[PDB]
Amino acid sequence: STTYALSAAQTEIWLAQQLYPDSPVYNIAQYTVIEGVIEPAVFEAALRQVIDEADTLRLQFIDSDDGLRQRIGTPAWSMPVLDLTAQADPQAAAQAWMRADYQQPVNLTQGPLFCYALLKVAPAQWMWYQRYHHIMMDGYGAYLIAQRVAYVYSALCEGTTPAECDFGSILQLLESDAQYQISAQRAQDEAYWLKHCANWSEPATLASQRLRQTTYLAIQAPDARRLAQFMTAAMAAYLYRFTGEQDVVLGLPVKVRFGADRHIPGMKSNTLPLRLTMRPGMNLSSLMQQAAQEMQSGLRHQRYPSEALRRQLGQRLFGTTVNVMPFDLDLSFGGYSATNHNLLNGPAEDLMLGVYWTPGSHQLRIDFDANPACYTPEGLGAHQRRFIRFMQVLAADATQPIDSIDLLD
């Protein structure tokens, strides 16, 4: 078989896992509540076919005298079917089983990298459990795999045999990344990103089990990327008004493009550094203009990975990360409606700002995913109350210079 090198993020995950082998933070857990009946055998066959379709679930990461590598394997896996029909609290026992799963650490050399289970906690209420490792999957690919399984199960139970996948093999990404490693374009992106972050500083940050506090709201006064740039400028202006930093840097995850016409599950996002300078008298329109300017003069070197940049330098480049994305559309599991609920995301990038919207809807959802060693349940809640009203004063007057705004408690 042919092996492939590990990406910088994958190598960091591997070494951080081997240093703390009792750490379950690199487990992404998810469960799907299906309000209806489920055929476990057809479900297992759909899991079959999608596992072989999204071949990132077939990767095995191994050690050798030549270094960390990865290849396509035939991983040995199971699908347990637990029936919690006869318990006083079936949901509690189901949550206990799932929590007992994703709380254990996962050895990466030889071991189950994903966990698929089926929980029946009511006569017509199933729960499909999904666990992965951060070295092989993110959240978006997990949702893609969830819908592919939903569609193929829907097909197989009604006699239909499903259409071909709209997925790309992970080998595409592996080979093009191997060729990008020896690329002149990679050396140019390196030179650019280290000229750009040369006389940089620390990151402006509100830093002092993973914390979360959600807040729903509605703004009156676009598309989606204007929403992204407005939220980026607002978070940067809030950081500057709270910390007094003219130079603040935010983390912006971008979906790298290199010629893949299909979504490759497991191919993650490169979070780029966006340094905004907040000169005096500046307003929101000026800050959004500078943000667009700086991302435009950086989206051509987007392929250069963040971890390689942070290693070619001298503990992080940014403390706050802005992730603007709508909610995922729901799935149908053989005619039955199913809604996903995530138990465990990934580790903390100090602070992750999540903005979730609905098409045609004015209501937003703000998420604060913070590191507990840097925030408190009270400090994070005060920042989200402070940041949101600041953002609302910004949305009502782009004419307003950031300095003349004074926010509360």
Numbering used by the authors: 7 to 214, 222 to 234, 240 to 332, 337 to 431
Sentences from the paper on this structure:
We found that compared with wild-type (WT) RzmA, mutations at R148 indeed altered the production profile of rhizomide in vivo. A similar trend, but in the reverse direction could be seen for the HolA A149 mutations, in which longer residue side chains led to shorter acyl chains. These synchronized changes showed that the length of the side-chain of this key amino acid (R148 in RzmA-Cs, A149 in HolA-Cs) might control the length of acyl chains. The side-chain may act as an entry gate to a potential pocket. Therefore, truncating the side-chain of this residue could give a correspondingly deeper space for the extension of longer acyl-CoAs. After our initial attempts to cocrystallize WT RzmA-Cs with acyl-CoAs of various lengths failed, we noticed that the R148A mutant protein showed strong binding to C8-CoA, as evidenced by the high ΔTm in protein thermal shift assays and a Kd value of ~300 nM measured using isothermal titration calorimetry (ITC). Thus we selected this mutant for crystallization, and successfully obtained both unbound and C8-CoA-bound structures. The unbound R148A structure is mostly identical to that of WT RzmA-Cs in two conformations.
Nonribosomal peptide synthetases (NRPSs) are multimodular enzymes that catalyze the biosynthesis of diverse peptides with a wide variety of activities. The incorporation of an acyl into peptidyl backbone is usually implemented by a starter condensation (Cs) domain, normally located at the beginning of the initial NRPS module, via the formation of an amide bond to the α-amino group of the first amino acid residue, a process also known as lipoinitiation. Genome mining of two Cs domain-embedded cryptic NRPS biosynthetic gene clusters, rzmA and holA, in the bacterium P. rhizoxinica HKI 454 resulted in the discovery of two distinct types of lipopeptides, cyclic rhizomide A (1) containing an uncommon acetyl chain (C2) and linear holrhizin A (2) harboring a medium octanoyl (C8) chain. Similar to other C domain structures reported previously, RzmA-Cs adopts a “V-shaped” configuration and consists of two subdomains (N- and C-lobes) each representing the chloramphenicol acetyltransferase (CAT) fold.
